[model samples]
Target chain A: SLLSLVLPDRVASAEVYDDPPGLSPLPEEEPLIARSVAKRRNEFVTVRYCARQALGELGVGPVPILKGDKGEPCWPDGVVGSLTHCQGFRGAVVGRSTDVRSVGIDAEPHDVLPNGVLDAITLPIERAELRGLPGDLHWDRILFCAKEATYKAWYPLTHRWLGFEDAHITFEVDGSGTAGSFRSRILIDPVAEHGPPLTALDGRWSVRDGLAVTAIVLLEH
Target chain B: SLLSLVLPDRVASAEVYDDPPGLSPLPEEEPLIARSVAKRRNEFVTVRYCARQALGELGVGPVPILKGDKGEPCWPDGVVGSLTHCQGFRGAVVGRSTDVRSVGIDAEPHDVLPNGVLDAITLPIERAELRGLPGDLHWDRILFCAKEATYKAWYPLTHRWLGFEDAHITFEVDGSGTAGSFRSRILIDPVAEHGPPLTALDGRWSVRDGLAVTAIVLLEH
Candidate 1:
């Protein structure tokens, strides 16, 4: 029962737009790049603002967010948060405790690319294994989306980055429902913390309208 | 005039090695999986042998050939070679042209992993405006680009299969090298069919003498 509660809140929510009207506008800042980058900046603004508001709702206060060199949003020295943005939505999560050292969130349009790039992101070996599964498709975009989310979630906490090739991911997408499942195995352990001694991690995935979302949280031992 | 001569030799001399001793032992009696399914069965052993022969030049197969998955050599026909073991050097290069279309090569030994998987794989719309140069730690992009070539080579022939996010790789080594210079994007367009679209590809690095290698040869283009 406790484990059930530990799972992510899969409850479907309102379809929010990532457009500027939904975001905190910066009037003085001239567009530095192209209209699209400006749009993404607007998206980041909208998502972070929502995350801050949600934290405020939890009675957490005055947390400051900083930017890393390449524009990653950094939390206040001791705070933790998760960020996600999709074609129609952008949002984040913030936790008050350092005890919760890991958190991540990701979103992507449910649309598929013509050249079939979505499936290629998986390691060749893993893709072959999944192709044995039943379906018109040997590979599933929904499944791939979930793993991408899982990775995006894992990166910030591990600090040691992971590649699409280093692991084989096995998952189930409840196509009839709004999400999919994600399970990953690191084929080659290149990090100090993740060796023979480490345990497997947990992840969650879901899809809505035309977007896929995934999140992974690192729990204490 | 010199360029013309060099081009033909490169095209004509691209070697084929399906008959290496160790790899050739694969029994014809055994049911062959679809070319897409059993892409690497015995070929990796042969390819690695060729690479060592080319790179080592002394006939010393620096890394022992390992047959994991119960001696089964399984590389997705949709991709290129799968590296199992490497030794005695920091880089390698190999090419194939029979059953696949494009080719990709990469070498990275434990160094810092560049943090830009998010940018390249992320939607182009969001990525186009970001001007920050990729990091010196480039293992992630190497892995991605190498795999991209594999996909390019594989997709045209398989006629039905993977795209970019279908695979996600996580590397254990501290990654180092260049990123974004995808040879496949320039040379081979899996989407095209006049002939081999790829012109060249290479990857190299020193990670304790066991530099990893990833190579792809496009088949359908």
Candidate 2:
């Protein structure tokens, strides 16, 4: 609800990077914003840019992106966030410390595989999950993308490397505004916690014009 | 100071695995600790026997010498203990949880290494630090051995993969007591931190009959 009020007011118009028909114009660049583009960029930059714009609206200064020794992106001192980019859609979520401990996002393109990528990432469970998906869908790739997003979101907190089997997720997309919608679980317990053994969390996802994008925000109590 | 109470009670003897030595009877049976042995089997079975004897002292059951998920031997839960069997020795540390929340042990042979092995692990600064050592001890191997011991101790807690370059060491030794101490820091900050960076706090090392053994521990505050 707050996003509606703030986001609309901040951007006069938005630009769709590659326009097919109708989409808003890209928002005007702010004077102090420092844009650091990787020479070979992935889709996640789009969402990171959007999230930066949102932060800019809230009076946070231009975000400086730096990579850690292991190359995990280092957000500026006061902000904590995660980025996910798949196919064409990229998503990022960030919040002030007083509100959320961490934010994670994920996006997916509704397309088929191109060989080695799927083979490299498919865990047995994911492979099994793929067997149940619709004939044309690529579940393995989708799960891979989601986990990458989860790890990116989680790394800043755990600082530990997680191989695919280290975590498992159960996510699904229901129509937006409905009661039983997007949900997930960090099934494997790499470290013990004070909560239930394998509890799942909830989130949101939708498919639009042949591309599917999903994002989740995890909060600390 | 706490160690002083236990030091006098220590069996005052250790089994040296390096050179064929004058045989001395083990004071009592205890669980075996095999650290960085040249072969996992040589280390695993040997440590298993030591574990059975060591754990047997505490009246622990069945000496369930099991392999870990990573294929390393697992001492059963509810058993408080430690294990280390390196090139020249296998050292077991056993105790109740209330008595010790941390444990570690390591050993290296005193023989000079081939130049190639030295070049691969010797960080420039570490090499420089080694150069400053008095006498003919190959400083290169000493630092590498110290780092290995530090990491062997660190792994059961941190459970994160750490490269030699991830940290540097500051070691202190008291040859009169055949013990040593050490400290370490991240050469570059790793992006993740659940609470804070881990520090060695303290450690020990010594050589006997041409083999080196080292250990360090930090109470789990």
Candidate 3:
């Protein structure tokens, strides 16, 4: 499964499909998306389904995952996690707080980015240095997924806004050309200084089955 | 010397400074920059001075270098070479065609890129992957030099346009943080196919004396 690309040992993960036949949202989660379309409801349930599976991996009792200040997942104390979904796929990964500071994962279809969208999210220097990369992957979209996962990982630790330009991301694909890792350098405050302090966060990325997936696990400082 | 980054055995090189009191442009090369400012004239003269010194190391007699289409330097029949200059530094590297297909070099001041200039030269994807690199060096300017040198090395082989995006460049710094190497993958025609064939060109880089230098030497191919 595409989710496995970002799944490392110890971080529990489960992959689900769109609106699985027998899956239904918990009484609490149902209210969160009840007014939306059935598609939205299915997305909500299957994703949370994976959440239960993941939390169960840690021997935690079944507790409905809810939202936080920025509409991010609010996990049980001592647990930090993230969830993401694409057109027909949803997945969740979680780990014990002691073992991981935060874990973030994102999924995107392996499709071309919308016109002008890539430019809006990228920095000028990044655009010049990474040009002409050789691969079948939609690298622009892959970059988007990586940044998405990075922010998800960063938000919990700092509770700060990491804009598209704030975190610099780079990719290195393996020989197989299907899987690789990325490095994210978080540039928090400008400080009006000579050089910004580089806070590097590492993650894995993979492209398969028309889907692109990325994950970042931030261990304790 | 910054040239050491690109200097490998078998390829001879020389470094010079702006219009030394006693140094003057070769009689044959005088016309190229004669009408330009003293700054441009000194840049041209001192750079070619290195060229003559470099050629002498290869047992070649003193011969004035000229220009080819696209204003690229024209070398001796059996030689493949490149030259570059910065505010106070000029350098050249030349190798036998049998041992090296081409060698490209570029030098630039270690300074931040001018506003809007980085955007024009960089591809949107490149703008993201190479962002937030950790170092005091001006990476934007370094990237420009890398691309500049990549084109020089590439033009001799195919006389093609290895535009900023046409040659994907990636930097891997050494522990010292002052020197590193880069890999350039040449992407020519967009074949409307799945993936691409990677034609990689390897080179080295160094930053010192407030100048960033890059080189690409294409071994016999």
On lDDT, the leading prediction is 3
Residue-level lDDT for B68 in candidate 1: 16
State TM-scores per candidate.
Answer: 0.44, 0.42, 0.48
Candidate 3: tens digits of C-alpha lDDT, residues A1-221: 67777667778888875767898776544435533346656777888898999899888888767554245676777888999988878999998878787798999989999887688778987777468566777888999999999888876655457888988888888998989999988777523111223387799999888888999986654
Give per-residue CA lDDT, model 1, range A1-221, as digits (tens).
11121234421111246455654433211111112235545764676566666566556554434332123345554455666666677766655444454565666666654375545567766667666655443245655655655565455544345666655777665655454556766665534333222234456666555556666665533
Give the TM-score ranking, best first: 3, 1, 2
Q: Candidate 3 at B54: error in angstroms? A: 84
iRMS, candidate 2, in Å: value is 23.2
lDDT (CA) per prediction = 0.42, 0.48, 0.76
DockQ of each: 0.02, 0.02, 0.01
- Can you write out model 2's per-residue Cα lDDT over A1-221, one digit (the tens) per residue? 21121111212111123313322222221111112123213233454465566567556765544333233544555565655444444444566645455555555566765675665555677667657644344555456656665666555555456655566555553434211123445655534222223244444444455554444455555
What pairs collide in candidate 3? A126-B126, A126-B127, A126-B128, A127-B126, A127-B127, A128-B122, A130-B126
lDDT of 2 by residue, B1-221 (tens): 11221221321113426333242222211112111223544554555455566666666654444322122234455443455566657656555544444455555676787767776665677767766655555555566766776665555445466667767776554645444555666565433222235643356656555666555554544
> Candidate 3 lDDT, tens digit per residue, B58-174?
999887765543456767768878988777788999999788877889999889999987876677766776686667778888889888888777665554456676777788999
**Clashes per candidate, residues 3 or more apart or on different chains:** 43, 20, 7
Residue B164 lDDT in candidate 2: 77
